Structure formats: C-alpha cells, structure tokens
Amino acid sequence: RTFRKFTYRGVDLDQLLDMSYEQLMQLYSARQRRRLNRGLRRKQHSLLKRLRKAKKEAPPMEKPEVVKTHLRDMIILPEMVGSMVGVYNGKTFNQVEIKPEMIGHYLGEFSITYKPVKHGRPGIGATHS
RNA sequence: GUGGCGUUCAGCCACCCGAGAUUGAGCAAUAACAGGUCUGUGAUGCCCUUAGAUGUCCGGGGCUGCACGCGCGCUACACUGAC
C-alpha cells in the first residue's frame, strides 16, 4: 500500500491500455499469446462491447452495472479492468471484480465450479478389515 | 529300427539315425445358472413419457471433487549401479 505501481511486465497500466493487440501478445505468456494470435471470435467481441457500454454508461465514482456471461474462457484483457462480470458456474452467476492484477488469467478461475468439501463420517463399509 | 519290461496284447522306458522322437493355438458335447448384457442394434413384450416432453439441439458445469478402506499396475530403494 506504500507504492501505487502496477507494472505488469515492467509496464504499468496506462501505456498498457493504449497498446495494441500485436505487442501485448509479446507481453503475455505462451497460452494467452496463442489465444490472441489465433482468432478471437464473435461472442468474445460482443462481451467486450457490452463491457465498454456498461463502463461508459456508469456515473462517475461508483462501480458499473454487472454484466453476466457464460464465457468462462475469456482472457482478461487490460480493456476489461475495473469491470463487473458475472461468471457462470453451471448453476449461478458469480460476482467478480476485475482487478488490475488479474490480466493474464481466464474468467473461469475466479468462479469456482464446485463446493470445497468438508467430510462427514465414513459410513458403513468404508473401513474393511 | 534296436534292446529291456509287459499276459508278450494294448502299451511303457532307454538308445541309434534324424531338422524334429510331446511346438503353440483355433474349434469344441449333454444338461444347466433367475450368471452378464434392454447402455451395441431399425432384436424385442409390457409399463412409463411424448410439446412446460424422459424426443432433440445449444451454452455452462459434472463424470476428475477428498479425514478414509480395497484391487490391477508403473517407478524405485542403487556400485551386478547412475552418469
């Protein structure tokens, strides 16, 4: 909290916003670079359009409206930061804050698909001889 | 084939010559099991369902989740070794 620098790969968020796709390919790691170099299809662009619209329609100095999606394989782009995304579990839409320091990840790893297990008592034949 | 045993039958043992003196499979009876499979089938009876479908397609998830118990395995514990 002492310093306010983001510095993703040595570059902070402003020139990391205005920089195009073809050099933040070089900025990312191998899997995200291959996803970006390969085609980024229609529904991903529709999600980005909805995120931009909900961002610019937000009144100043509060959070934008939550945007739901099934696309839990979207790369979290720098364009997406500070947004309000509901990511599907199969069952529910989970509220996720797109923080600046999650820009190399998928949306799927912020909405957990299962309930973590706490064990009951081993039932009957659970312990053999 | 030769020798020996055998009721001198059916055969067995040893040996010579030989590539070889018993290569490995496949197929495979009568009678059966409430064995498994309706999730192989445009094999199938009966029951259920049939539009807010248990038909079908699309999106996402699960089948892989982890205090524990069991089974088939893989890699090892090195100097008959590793590099």
Curated annotation (Swiss-Prot):
NCBIfam families per the UniProt record, alphabetical: PRK04038.1 (NF003121), uS19_arch (TIGR01025)
Protein localization: Cytoplasm
Signal peptide: none
SUPFAM superfamilies membership: Ribosomal protein S19
Organism: Homo sapiens (Human)
Positions of crosslink type Glycyl lysine isopeptide (Lys-Gly) (interchain with G-Cter in SUMO2): 99
Example of a GO MF term: MDM2/MDM4 family protein binding
Main subcellular localisation: cytoplasm
Oligomeric form and interacting partners: Component of the small ribosomal subunit.
GO process terms (BP): cytoplasmic translation; liver regeneration; osteoblast differentiation; positive regulation of signal transduction by p53 class mediator; ribosomal small subunit assembly; ribosomal small subunit biogenesis; ribosomal small subunit export from nucleus; rRNA processing
Keywords noted in UniProt: Acetylation, Cytoplasm, Isopeptide bond, Ribonucleoprotein, Ribosomal protein, Ubl conjugation
Lineage top rank: taxon: Eukaryota
InterPro entries registered for this protein in UniProt: Ribosomal_uS19 (IPR002222), Ribosomal_uS19_CS (IPR020934), Ribosomal_uS19_euk/arc (IPR005713), Ribosomal_uS19_SF (IPR023575)
Functional description taken from the UniProt entry: Component of the small ribosomal subunit. The ribosome is a large ribonucleoprotein complex responsible for the synthesis of proteins in the cell.
Alphabetical list of Pfam families matching this protein: Ribosomal_S19
Similarity comment: Belongs to the universal ribosomal protein uS19 family.
Name the UniProt record assigns to this protein: Small ribosomal subunit protein uS19
Entry GO terms, CC: cytoplasm; cytosol; cytosolic ribosome; cytosolic small ribosomal subunit; focal adhesion; membrane; nucleoplasm; nucleus
Name of the gene encoding the protein in the UniProt record: RPS15
